[PDB]
């Protein structure tokens, strides 16, 4: 009886910048965020949608009625939270129609409480294989406009329905974590931006791969030469082949070309969205799903979870026979392709604009499921 | 093959008020605190201690240098955290020593987060019968002065170590679970006060247990009768009492009485703290186990979970042969009594003093795990 990945999908914002347009904007070269970070379109949201409206959006492409009926279970992976108390999953539970005898709740640990959510899910649905659960990553990255990590923003969510006999992916039970009290990036309690030390982050993430990679092969024996492909959790797509570079550099040069190969692959879809926290991982992993014509049934995939503060995760999945047949490539190229692409000054204005939730008052957005109205701090949504 | 909580305990400020000055200071009959509420003293806490800090007392209290090399998953359930990106069971895992492979996060969902952290705990377990779990509710629940929550306020931590073969409970495979999106209390980013309702907290909390009791019921026949023992989560004593009272009725007089009886037993030690939020219920775990003279090895005992939003759990665990042997009670005794007692006045001062994150600074509390220091909004830990 396999566990996994039964349907995935991903919600990103009806708008975008293009990365020239924002270089040459804060008069830099044209060139320095597409190739020194490695993004080209940056996903950009209005005060009127949230994690919740990416959330509902990401699921609802993949949930049927039986579905709904069969999930008992459903988590919310994310850093951007809108209550200090109230998970999010439960207005996700009701918006989605999912059956009333479920548990729901939230998962925070930075960019890696959706992995979270996907390994407790998988646990859940193993010792009840009748069960589903719904684990979905949303997030909304600003730093701040002309801030640092500018360049890195993104917002959206990955859904994902975890089942038995999955028709995607089959999770193995070869995980491998990590926790270490590191300050790479946080947001205290207030703090609409979070603090973030640029160094420390690249060399954390780095270095936590490396020990997970290190550990998970000391306790498999499993190498490189024994993945197919490997989906990176990634603020940005250099930092990833950063840290693939630092310890695949003993590979033989055909190995080595073949991992880069398939880690450009892994970021065709991300270079169009930018960072999405708990999502960036799992948008990795559609990506090459979608994209990555090498890979077959019965291939390895790697996947290496990240979250500053900072945990980490090594996990492998195995794609089942027909996967091809079940992914929503067509929806997620509509997408993006008809994203409505901002000038700088229709972006910072978007990106500025504040929700005061204090205030009583109404919002218009023609996006199903973005925020509706505010009464007395509470969201309404427009499903 | 049992799995469920093998050692347990808790841990509060050495602060509190008695119930009777609240009430002459606020000008309202004593009798509505003592009686009306059922609270007799109120856990209070200074700004120099937060969720770490009680959370690492709790667990130190239980663990020893073996628990630390077993468990691969520390989980903090909290709707009191201190950043919006970073667990704080990150921070727990250093303190506490434990192994460096294991994953940390927070999970969030009001007053039911630590027992989705137990249920999830559980499978882990199950699945790897060789590892341990630390499970860590852990809150600070502050209405504000002359507030209608007031009088429920409350701080600490419960910390639990879930394994395979526990000593303590073992737990049964008959959970039922309910989401429902009703706002009858939250607490928007940014409001260090939660919202409430109090009406409709009462009313969704005993229709929450009505309806998985009912559920239960019709999926396995148990009634009431087939309890030893309830645990309730509490918010105020007279709380689970309400729900109990509102379900059993039709019970014979004798059986009404028996489980009051048992009921007043399980609130012992809330009486004398407060709302815990996530660890209320488990708190009423350790009263009942350390109260109850008439329990024994063998006993049913039902907890029903509730955290607004809102969600809510129904499930079953048995007294293991031996439980009163790895038990607190002196421990926690001696935490209670031997807590300074505060005047209303030095109260105020304590509850209203905040916490700067954006001043560095040093503070100095001879608690152990107490904050002694904030860095560029970073938390330092005396140790
Ligand atoms: C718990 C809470 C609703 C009580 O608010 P409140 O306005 O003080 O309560 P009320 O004024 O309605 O009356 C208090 C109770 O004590 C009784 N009472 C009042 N004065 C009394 C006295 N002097 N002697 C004895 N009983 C007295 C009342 O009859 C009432 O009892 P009942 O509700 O069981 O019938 C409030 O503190 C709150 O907002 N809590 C936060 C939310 C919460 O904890 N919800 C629980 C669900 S999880």
Same mark, same amino acid.
């Given at each position: %009886?396999?566990?996994?990945?039964?349907?995935?999908?991903?919600?990103?914002?009806?708008?975008?910048?293009?990365?020239?347009?924002?270089?040459?904007?804060?008069?830099?070269?044209?060139?320095?965020?597409?190739?020194?970070?490695?993004?080209?379109? %940056?996903?950009?949201?209005?005060?009127?949608?949230?994690?919740?409206? +990416?959330?509902?959006?990401?699921?609802?492409?993949?949930? *049927?009625?039986?579905?709904?009926?069969?999930?008992?279970?459903?988590?919310?992976?994310?850093?951007?939270?809108?209550?200090?108390?109230?998970?999010?999953?439960?207005?996700?539970?009701?918006?989605?129609?999912?059956?009333?005898?479920?548990?729901?709740?939230?998962?925070?640990?930075?960019?890696?409480?959706? *992995?979270?959510?996907?390994?407790?899910?998988?646990?859940?649905?193993?010792?009840?294989?009748?069960?589903?659960?719904?684990?979905?990553?949303?997030?909304?990255?600003?730093?701040?406009?002309?801030?640092?990590?500018?360049?890195?923003?993104?917002?959206?969510?990955?859904?994902?329905?975890?089942?038995?006999?999955?028709?995607?992916?089959?999770?193995?039970?070869?995980?491998?974590?990590?926790?270490?009290?590191?300050?790479? +990036?946080?947001?205290?309690?207030?703090?609409?931006?979070?603090?973030?030390? /640029?160094?420390?982050?690249?060399?954390?993430?780095?270095?936590?791969?490396?020990?997970?990679?290190?550990?998970?092969?000391?306790?498999?024996?499993?190498?490189?030469?024994?993945?197919?492909?490997?989906? !990176?959790?990634?603020?940005?797509?250099?930092?990833?082949?950063?840290?693939?570079?630092?310890?695949?550099?003993?590979?033989?040069?055909?190995?080595?070309?073949?991992?880069?190969?398939?880690?450009?692959?892994?970021?065709?879809?991300?270079?169009?969205?930018?960072?999405?926290?708990?999502?960036?991982?799992?948008?990795?992993?559609?990506?090459?799903?979608?994209?990555?014509?090498?890979? *077959?049934? /019965?291939?390895?995939?790697?996947?290496?979870?990240?979250?500053?503060?900072?945990?980490?995760? !090594? +996990?492998?999945?195995?794609?089942?026979?027909?996967?091809?047949?079940?992914?929503?490539?067509?929806?997620?190229?509509?997408?993006?392709?008809?994203?409505?692409?901002?000038?700088?000054?229709?972006?910072?204005? %978007?990106?500025?604009?504040?929700?005061?939730?204090?205030?009583?008052?109404?919002?218009?957005?023609?996006?199903?499921?973005?925020?509706?109205?505010?009464?007395?701090?509470?969201?309404?949504?427009?499903?």
């Amino acid at each position: %009886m396999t566990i996994g990945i039964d349907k995935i999908s991903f919600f990103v914002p009806p708008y975008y910048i293009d990365m020239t347009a924002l270089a040459e904007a804060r008069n830099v070269d044209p060139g320095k965020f597409h190739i020194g970070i490695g993004q080209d379109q %940056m996903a950009v949201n209005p005060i009127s949608q949230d994690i919740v409206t +990416f959330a509902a959006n990401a699921a609802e492409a993949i949930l *049927t009625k039986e579905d709904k009926e069969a999930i008992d279970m459903v988590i919310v992976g994310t850093e951007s939270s809108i209550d200090e108390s109230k998970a999010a999953a439960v207005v996700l539970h009701r918006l989605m129609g999912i059956q009333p005898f479920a548990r729901s709740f939230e998962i925070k640990e930075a960019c890696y409480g959706a *992995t979270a959510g996907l390994q407790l899910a998988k646990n859940h649905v193993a010792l009840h294989p009748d069960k589903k659960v719904l684990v979905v990553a949303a997030d909304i990255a600003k730093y701040g406009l002309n801030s640092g990590g500018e360049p890195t923003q993104g917002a959206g969510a990955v859904a994902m329905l975890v089942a038995s006999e999955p028709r995607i992916l089959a999770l193995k039970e070869d995980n491998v974590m990590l926790t270490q009290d590191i300050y790479d +990036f946080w947001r205290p309690t207030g703090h609409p931006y979070p603090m973030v030390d /640029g160094p420390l982050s690249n060399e954390t993430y780095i270095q936590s791969f490396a020990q997970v990679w290190d550990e998970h092969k000391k306790r498999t024996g499993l190498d490189f030469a024994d993945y197919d492909a490997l989906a !990176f959790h990634i603020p940005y797509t250099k930092m990833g082949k950063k840290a693939l570079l630092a310890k695949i550099s003993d590979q033989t040069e055909a190995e080595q070309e073949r991992i880069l190969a398939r880690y450009e692959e892994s970021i065709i879809y991300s270079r169009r969205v930018g960072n999405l926290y708990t999502g960036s991982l799992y948008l990795g992993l559609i990506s090459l799903l979608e994209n990555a014509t090498t890979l *077959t049934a /019965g291939n390895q995939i790697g996947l290496f979870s990240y979250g500053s503060g900072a945990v980490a995760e !090594f +996990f492998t999945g195995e794609l089942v026979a027909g996967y091809q047949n079940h992914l929503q490539k067509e929806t997620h190229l509509a997408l993006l392709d008809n994203r409505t692409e901002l000038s700088i000054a229709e972006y910072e204005a %978007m990106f500025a604009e504040t929700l005061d939730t204090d205030i009583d008052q109404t919002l218009e957005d023609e996006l199903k499921y973005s925020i509706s109205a505010i009464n007395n701090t509470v969201r309404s949504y427009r499903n």
